[PDB]
Curated annotation (Swiss-Prot), chain A:
Pfam families: Ribosomal_L39 (PF00832). Component of the large ribosomal subunit (LSU). Mature yeast ribosomes consist of a small (40S) and a large (60S) subunit. The 40S small subunit contains 1 molecule of ribosomal RNA (18S rRNA) and 33 different proteins (encoded by 57 genes). The large 60S subunit contains 3 rRNA molecules (25S, 5.8S and 5S rRNA) and 46 different proteins (encoded by 81 genes). eL39 interacts with YIH1. Keywords: Cytoplasm, Ribonucleoprotein, Ribosomal protein. This is Large ribosomal subunit protein eL39. InterPro entries: Ribosomal_eL39, Ribosomal_eL39_CS, Ribosomal_eL39_dom_sf. It comes from the Eukaryota. Residues 6-19 have a biased composition (Basic residues).
Curated annotation (Swiss-Prot), chain B:
Present with 97700 molecules/cell in log phase SD medium. There are 2 genes for eL19 in yeast. Component of the large ribosomal subunit (LSU). Mature yeast ribosomes consist of a small (40S) and a large (60S) subunit. The 40S small subunit contains 1 molecule of ribosomal RNA (18S rRNA) and 33 different proteins (encoded by 57 genes). The large 60S subunit contains 3 rRNA molecules (25S, 5.8S and 5S rRNA) and 46 different proteins (encoded by 81 genes). eL19 lies in close proximity to the binding site for eukaryotic initiation factor eIF4G. Coiled coil: none annotated. It is found in: Cytoplasm. The modification Phosphoserine is found at S28. This is Large ribosomal subunit protein eL19A. Belongs to the eukaryotic ribosomal protein eL19 family. There is a cross-link at K83 (Glycyl lysine isopeptide (Lys-Gly) (interchain with G-Cter in ubiquitin)). Residues 1-22 are annotated as: Disordered. Component of the ribosome, a large ribonucleoprotein complex responsible for the synthesis of proteins in the cell. The small ribosomal subunit (SSU) binds messenger RNAs (mRNAs) and translates the encoded message by selecting cognate aminoacyl-transfer RNA (tRNA) molecules. The large subunit (LSU) contains the ribosomal catalytic site termed the peptidyl transferase center (PTC), which catalyzes the formation of peptide bonds, thereby polymerizing the amino acids delivered by tRNAs into a polypeptide chain.
Swiss-Prot record, chain C:
PANTHER family: 60S RIBOSOMAL PROTEIN L37A (PTHR48129), LARGE RIBOSOMAL SUBUNIT PROTEIN EL43 (PTHR48129:SF1). HAMAP family: Ribosomal_eL43. SUPFAM superfamilies: Zn-binding ribosomal proteins (SSF57829). Belongs to the eukaryotic ribosomal protein eL43 family. This is Large ribosomal subunit protein eL43A. A zinc finger (C4-type) spans 38-59. NCBIfam families: eL43_euk_arch, PRK03976.1.
From Swiss-Prot, chain F:
The modification Phosphoserine is found at S51, S94, S158, S159. This is Large ribosomal subunit protein uL2A. GO terms for molecular function: RNA binding; rRNA binding; structural constituent of ribosome. Pfam families: Ribosomal_L2, Ribosomal_L2_C. There is a cross-link at K45, K92, K118, K144 (Glycyl lysine isopeptide (Lys-Gly) (interchain with G-Cter in ubiquitin)). Component of the large ribosomal subunit (LSU). Mature yeast ribosomes consist of a small (40S) and a large (60S) subunit. The 40S small subunit contains 1 molecule of ribosomal RNA (18S rRNA) and 33 different proteins (encoded by 57 genes). The large 60S subunit contains 3 rRNA molecules (25S, 5.8S and 5S rRNA) and 46 different proteins (encoded by 81 genes). It comes from Saccharomyces cerevisiae (strain ATCC 204508 / S288c). SUPFAM superfamilies: Nucleic acid-binding proteins, Translation proteins SH3-like domain. Its main location: cytoplasm. The gene is RPL2A.
Amino acid sequence: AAQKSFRIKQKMAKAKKQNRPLPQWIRLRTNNTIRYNAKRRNWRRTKMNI
Amino acid sequence: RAHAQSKREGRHSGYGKRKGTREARLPSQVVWIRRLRVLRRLLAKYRDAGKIDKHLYHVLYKESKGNAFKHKRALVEHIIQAKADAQREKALNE
Amino acid sequence: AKRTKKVGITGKYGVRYGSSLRRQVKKLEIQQHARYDCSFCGKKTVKRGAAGIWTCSCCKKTVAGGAYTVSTAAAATVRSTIRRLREMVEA
Amino acid sequence: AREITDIKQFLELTRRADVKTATVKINKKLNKAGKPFRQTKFKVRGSSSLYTLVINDAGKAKKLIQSLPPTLKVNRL
Amino acid sequence: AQRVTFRRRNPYNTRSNKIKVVKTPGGILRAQHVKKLATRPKCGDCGSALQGISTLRPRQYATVSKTHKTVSRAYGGSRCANCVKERIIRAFLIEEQKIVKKVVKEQTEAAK
Amino acid sequence: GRVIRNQRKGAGSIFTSHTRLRQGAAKLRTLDYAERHGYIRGIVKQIVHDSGRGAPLAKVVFRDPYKYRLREEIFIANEGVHTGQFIYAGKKASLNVGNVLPLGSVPEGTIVSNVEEKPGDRGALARASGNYVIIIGHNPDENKTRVRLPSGAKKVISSDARGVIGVIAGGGRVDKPLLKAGRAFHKYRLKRNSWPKTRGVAMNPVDHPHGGGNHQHIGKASTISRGAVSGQKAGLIAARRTGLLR
RNA sequence: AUGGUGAACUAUGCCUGAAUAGGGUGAAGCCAGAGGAAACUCUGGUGGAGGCUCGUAGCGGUUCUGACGUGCAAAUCGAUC
RNA sequence: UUCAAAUGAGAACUUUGAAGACUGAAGUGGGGAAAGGUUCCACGUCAACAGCAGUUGGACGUGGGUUAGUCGAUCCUAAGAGAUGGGGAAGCUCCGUUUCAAAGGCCUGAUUUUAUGCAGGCCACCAUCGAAAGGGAAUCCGGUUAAGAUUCCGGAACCUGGAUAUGGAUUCUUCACGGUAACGUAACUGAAUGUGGAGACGUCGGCGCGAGCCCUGGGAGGAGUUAUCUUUUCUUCUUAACAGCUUAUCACCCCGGAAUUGGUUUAUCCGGAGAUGGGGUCUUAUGGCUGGAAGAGGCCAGCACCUUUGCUGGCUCCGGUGCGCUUGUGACGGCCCGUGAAAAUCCACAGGAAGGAAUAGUUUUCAUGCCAGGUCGUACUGAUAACCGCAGCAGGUCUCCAAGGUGAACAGCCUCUAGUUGAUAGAAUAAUGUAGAUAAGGGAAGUCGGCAAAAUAGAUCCGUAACUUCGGGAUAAGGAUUGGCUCUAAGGGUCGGGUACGAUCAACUUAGAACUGGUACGGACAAGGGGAAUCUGACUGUCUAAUUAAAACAUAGCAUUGCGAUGGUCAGAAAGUGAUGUUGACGCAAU
């Protein structure tokens, strides 16, 4: 909120680092069920609620 | 600059050019203040200059807080007439 | 130039509130805004700051007193009654 | 951010052992009304402050510059 | 026709947040935050501001020489020197008449 | 039904007192040796305005007996006191306005205020502005005193109970019409949340016993038994008579 | 019926902050003159009060029974007030 | 909105230029608070999203970006929350916040076996939490990035905690001198203890003084216009924190002693309780000169040239004005049955514990010098697409700065600085619509009803009724003028007179007179319709958010009622329990 507490800022940074798609080499692996990143979050879609 | 140079000679001033009331334009207090600070401060130079004595000063000072004084010239004709009242009455008693 | 006739100080209230109430206040607000002699410094500086408190601007004495006036009615007969009972025992 | 007036007092701070450096600024101004002259300033650097002397008469300003201590390393202009 | 902002994150016009408008050397108007003014110290007796003391904020007196904070009378930085003139009069003439009272209590023994 | 408005003041949430600007609790001095065996003198430093009250306060500054210091206390200022006045307190004090004496020490017909119910409660009776009690008689054995409470009731108290001479300042206060709903708003912001008062007539059968009906009217007697029970009591409570006096 | 959750909306009190062009009317208080025995009254000033008034921002939400009414909007838009 | 160009496979929509417009500084600008959380920035890419398109994107994939002793938090307390000791409760837990408490660690003397025993004295406030808008130790200018700066760079300061060294000062009168005094100063001893000031405070009204802005004349430069006129129109001439020196209202001291009462403010308050007068002290918001600091910044010209680019000179000056606007401040005044926070923190004074001059002893409240200054926040929007409303929603949302003209005006209209030009478009001009206008004659004959529209409107002069609680009603009702040009008149200042006049400078105000024209003139804008009665509530105020704003609720005023504390009214499951109550009948409670 432009001037922050560290426990909030530490939770913004965890959500910044989950913000990327799958790495491609994961699909290539034997018995892979996973297709795409289903938990992708977006600041225009779902607000993370702190 | 030409519109304001026209006003300085009085143009565009007439009644159709006036919208706010005569107070809104120039409040009447500011005019009294100017009248009196000018009168009240002209007496203080005469008292200091000895051409009026603090007995007549103290009289005129309180007339100016009422009026009996139209402007700086009426007061100067007033002193000269009032001061001349001190000469005659003294001279007649002498 | 007396301006108003009856209402005086209560002209501030305008036409509202009814004539008696406006006239009954004019009784007191001429007392609380009035200027009184000072029983100490010998001048009249005394004015009211608040209900109960009366402040000299000369000798800086503050003086307790009546709400709307310096000396309450029933007070000036207490300090005589107290002056009398004091002499009773000492005389 | 201070100023010195007497020449002598200025000669002290130059030796005061906190002063590593100084400088000489030359400013061309004019005095009274008509005619110019050459004005110089000497700025000695303390630890906590900066002292300056103003010489408006150039007959003095030259005798002063030579008088600076040799250890003090001066940056002219 | 220039306009200027606060230099701090307080958007609001409160008592500490005052602004003064300054022309910098670089030609621009810029706002300058100003600290609240200092009140003169008061006589603990008559209340009138007691002259000779420098008017600062409270913790800015810790940085100042003692001549700013004092005068050289008794009760120097405290009472207004006409409140010291009285309490000398009152200390002398109360303990003056108070001696005259203690001789009368020796006389009232021998008089009765 | 609902819980009515006077039942709602007991839990004391928004109904508490507005205490911020009040100078303190105005009391008399603790009863000690120096005061009950003799007198002790203070001086009144400044007589000042207290918020929420109607009468001014005085601050008199005593000297602590057993330790070096000053102690200053809050007296409701009697009328006629002035800053710079010596205020004497104790059994052997003198009868003058502002001096606090025991009641046994003053003749009958003496006008005192801020008198105590029991000795050492630091004041109870006649603390409002303009009030006083009169001393109408004594009972020197099994010591008591007969005084007239400001309402006109006659109470009998101990003779060691102190009281301060004179009338309380701030007399004449209610003589002045209040004149508008604003001035009554500025009165009760410094006191408590009592105001304004909705007539129980004008509300619903839930809000009050007087509520309901296709006309505004009470419907049953407006005098209620003293032996009524919580929330039944609204209106004139256990009145012996009613109606305009003659 | 039992056991739990909510005053970010809204209701009301407190604490501590902030916000409000320009005009009209011209109360006490005060100053000079005029009258008269008086108590006082009459004229010219001065001052700048009020839960005064016209009216912007602000807060509302009277009329059109306007627009809209599968709307921009699950309460909004315009004029008026 | 339009033309062209560039990109591209593809352009009403991307980018640059050229035009045309708009928001108009109460902005469609320049910044923050809550909230979001990476939306900021760069490069690539165009499946989906952007209710048309898309080469653009707040999208997509990959990266980079937030720097502090001084700015905030952190600390203090407010309104309140909440342990402990205790007290209830089968119990979850409740009361209460210094309370029925053995509630604690200090200042150094005594020690020169060794450090701290034993020593006298003290001080009784006895958790903690609670504000990024209140209180508060200290930082400014210039430059810098694709994106960060009161943080980075360069320079100039300052505060705090700690260590000690040097110079001065003081000391033989051991702990300074001067002035009648206000008080002065580079310094110039001070424990327990106590007291005083600061922190520290409402609002309105005019008055004064400042700062930035506005206007503006001489001069030095750059740009735009020139068919003709125009000593012309626009633009740059700037000065930070900090430091030293001098300055003023109010306050004060000395001298003298007032009737022939004087001084005096816009506002009538002041004087034998000592006024005017003559001479001094003081604070230093504020202003003034000097240092910062011209070496910076700006504006011009002159030379070199893929680069990198510099280099090189010059000028950066002297003034005027105000009922101007914005904010700060000071002295006064008004208002109240309203008198408008607390604390940490810092200082002074009273006192005199002690400790120390002479062969020499101190003082870090005088100077200078020396060392350290941690932790988390810092990007960007703050909204007609970054917040909330299912969304890229015409809604909702606290705050600062604020240019010229017109005008009473922060209204309306128009412009300069900055910012956009986004909302699907093209061609046609049927009906019915929606929003905006106009009508011959008549003038509510329409309708439940003048609903809706029109009429009125600004200012100046003339004039105003019944009634009235004498305050009002009153802009009552009603009438007359208003443009342009050219003149006349009145209103102020600074200034020299041996112990009447002259000159110069500078204002927006009012009144009057001639002339003038398609009788037009508050020329657009902006801007009351008025009168004779009745019912009803006195008034201001409040309420069904989203069908009711009322004659309903409220109010002042009036009256009644309980209550003297071992109490009135109420709460709790209980209580060593609680609200009124920091109360006391001129009060509290119930009507």
